Paper text:
We collected serial diffraction data for on-chip crystallized human aquaporin 2 (hAQP2) at room temperature at LCLS using the fast-scanning Roadrunner II goniometer. From two Roadrunner II chips we obtained 3377 hits from 137 476 collected frames (a 2.5% hit rate), leading to 2723 indexed patterns (an 80.6% indexing rate). The rod-shaped hAQP2 crystals showed a strong preference for two distinct orientations rotated along their long fourfold symmetry axis when lying on the flat silicon-chip surface. The corresponding diffraction patterns collected with a beam perpendicular to the chip plane hence show a strong bias and Bragg peaks only cover a very narrow region of reciprocal space. In order to obtain a complete data set, we tilted the chip by 25° during SX data collection. Each monomer contains a water channel surrounded by six transmembrane helices and two half-helices forming a pseudo-transmembrane helix. Despite the limited resolution of the data, clear density for a water molecule is observed in the middle of the water-conducting pore of one of the hAQP2 monomers, close to the conserved NPA region. Therefore, the weaker diffraction properties of the crystals used in this work are most likely to be owing to their significantly smaller size compared with the crystals used for previous structural determination and do not originate from our on-chip crystallization method. The hit rates of 2.5% as observed for hAQP2 on the Roadrunner II chips were low for a fixed-target experiment and can probably be attributed to the low protein concentration that was used.
Here, a new method of on-chip crystallization is reported which allows the efficient and reproducible growth of large numbers of protein crystals directly on micro-patterned silicon chips for in-situ serial crystallography experiments. Crystals are grown by sitting-drop vapor diffusion and previously established crystallization conditions can be directly applied. As a consequence, ‘naked’ crystals are obtained on the chip, resulting in very low background scattering levels and making the crystals highly accessible for external manipulation such as the application of ligand solutions. Serial diffraction experiments carried out at cryogenic temperatures at a synchrotron and at room temperature at an X-ray free-electron laser yielded high-quality X-ray structures of the human membrane protein aquaporin 2 and two new ligand-bound structures of thermolysin and the human kinase DRAK2.
Residue numbers in the entry:
A (entry chain C): 5 to 226
B (entry chain A): 5 to 232
C (entry chain D): 7 to 226
D (entry chain B): 5 to 110, 115 to 238
Write the structure that this text describes.
């Protein structure tokens, strides 16, 4: 339709590429030294914040189809821009995890940090967990973008990143914290095992819609 | 216009619910390793930061009856709004603890975090520690949301959240860090562990009160006369 | 009058700073504190204190910072003496309360300042010199009046400065940067081994910093 | 203005000095006190934060030859001040490293592949690291971004933190050739030294190119537009 549209879609592609790459690659490589829950959370959150700043101003930095449909409820995002955004997000995620697999060594590929069931908890409980996780994430993103709220420079990005960090604390203790269908799809399509993939591709979306409607109809309607 | 009041009470309920959720759920689950002190303090701090961000701009996000009483002395003056806010914080807290029990497996149920007197610390020492914790938190909150700092907000949610993180370092080293009567009332009811449950309901409260009093009289009062 | 409210604000700021600082820096036998945990303690502490009492009276929380500002930005000599006095009093009283509330088996030494993993004295004097140098540099360049048209994140920035200075300075000695924070545990426990280095290390550094930032880095 | 230039190059020298001091300092290998990766990334990131604030407001705070070349391509910078900045960065870096040897009982934080697998492609890892770093640095300071004022010294700092997570896991994270040069120059371990110097540079440039030709080209002035139209 326009040129800024193409720059926006490309910014989303590169965004989810760097996010999946830096995230999965940050959490994965465990030699004698070992990454921690708070360390991985700091990784995913900090990456989300950084990309949200830069590409943030170009295209909004959704880096997530769940916040793309939760934004389709009321971010002035068209269904065409929705299709192109989720397309660039899926392809960018798969390209990021794939490039990671190409640059990462061979002893440590392991599970490529695929989210799944942890510590024996049925699928409904994980669905509820992801529901609340992406619910608070979507609440934070819709709050840090409400252009009628005074803010200092760069505080919204840090707040969204820290939200991803907290959601990675609890969500990491339950199902590795999905919060993003592309972030859980990319390592699967790179390495396999679609086991318990329905929770992820369902978890955030429910919450998304919920959260979205909330902040647009029950919490702070315009 | 009571629909804004209803959105406010609902925001208090949902916000306290999420706070108890992420707080306890991220505080107890210790299957493989242990929960690091900085990890729990970061959990509560970043959670309160996020809620104060969103439902902070919607409702102020007290997420705390003690901050509600301190606000009753300071932010406003004598309000059934403070009353209803207390009620919604209680409901949201207990509901969040129960929902946490159901979403979790009956595996790392543990104590559900009834932060008891640890490392051989007495009761009065605990009420004093918690008194100072909620003192510094109430100070930070009253300073961030002051009409004298309304020109540019400047990281209110981040400053408050990090304040909660520090208070969680010290308090966690003492009695698990309360800083919230509802947060201590929910899991003690859901799991039935009532060992030492008056300290917090006494520690924070007066502490918060003291804070308000200080910040409203010995520190920075309203202008006594417009001459200065 | 309002002056007295300011020096009371400094007294309270140092009270809570030393209390929370040494309290979180204490070595508890159920969860060994990490370097990042103590750095976060002091960092976030001075952060929120600088928020509130930074709104009130600048929140120095450091006699060395009060001296650096004395050279720097028109501060009355009696305000500096009263600030340093209230900071020392708040420090010793806060550490005293921490000593009163904490059990005996865990109050190992209230996090006294002692060099470790070998090292001399002047080496600590120049390490601490550079630590307080960067601290006062960030503090001055984050509370500038002729820059006030553009603010920023002053409290968070100063706090995280204290945090990194606590990473390196903790790996060397425990990161002083503050004579009151180093003096209160001393008075509480009569352990004064190589205590003068700090009273000289940070201090002189701050001075340098001030002069530098005001006379070389950004002269009028 | 002839003095403000010297203030700029001197602020660059001092920024690189203290930066290297704290980075390698907290990055040292202490006995019975194993520093965690997040502590290293926190040290470097917060250091970049305070230095980018302090001097950042003084002299823009490059503290990095890679971003100095990047700003030679984009942020309105001549070759003279760029070269002088680079010299100040190298000199300040080796000075800080030497001082850290003056404060260290007798490997100095200099980076090299620790894990021993897929070395050159790790050079590509450096490419992407400085890609995201330069992207965040460019978009942190854009008038078009608005948001009342800009530059959160924090914006650049936390970017450096995450980059330091991934890099520390791979090749200790270069992102800054002076940092990778000083302790090596004072420590005969030049193993795969061409990696680092090549990693950021390429990366940085690409980032600039993207942010200046693909993502958000700058609003050209008429006087420069006449230079591209001649």
């Amino acid at each position: 339709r326009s040129i800024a549209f193409s720059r926006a879609v490309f910014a989303e592609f590169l965004a989810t590429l760097l996010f999946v790459f830096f995230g999965l690659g940050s959490a994965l490589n465990w030699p004698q030294a070992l990454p921690s829950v708070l360390q991985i959370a700091m990784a995913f959150g900090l990456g989300i914040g950084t990309l949200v700043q830069a590409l943030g101003h170009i295209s909004g930095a959704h880096i997530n189809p769940a916040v793309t449909v939760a934004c389709l409820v009321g971010c002035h995002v068209s269904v065409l821009r929705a299709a192109f955004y989720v397309a660039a997000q899926l392809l960018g995620a798969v390209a990021g995890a794939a490039l990671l697999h190409e640059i990462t060594p061979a002893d440590i590929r392991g599970d490529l940090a695929v989210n799944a069931l942890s510590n024996s908890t049925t699928a409904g409980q994980a669905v509820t967990v992801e529901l609340f996780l992406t619910l608070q994430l979507v609440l934070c993103i819709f709050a840090s973008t409400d252009e009628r709220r005074g803010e200092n420079p760069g505080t919204p990005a840090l707040s969204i990143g820290f939200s991803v960090a907290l959601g990675h604390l609890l969500g990491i203790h339950y199902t590795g914290c999905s919060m993003n269908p592309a972030r859980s799809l990319a390592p699967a399509v790179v390495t396999g095992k679609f086991d318990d993939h329905w929770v992820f591709w369902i978890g955030p979306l429910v919450g998304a819609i919920l959260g979205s409607l909330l902040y647009n109809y029950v919490l702070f309607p315009p």
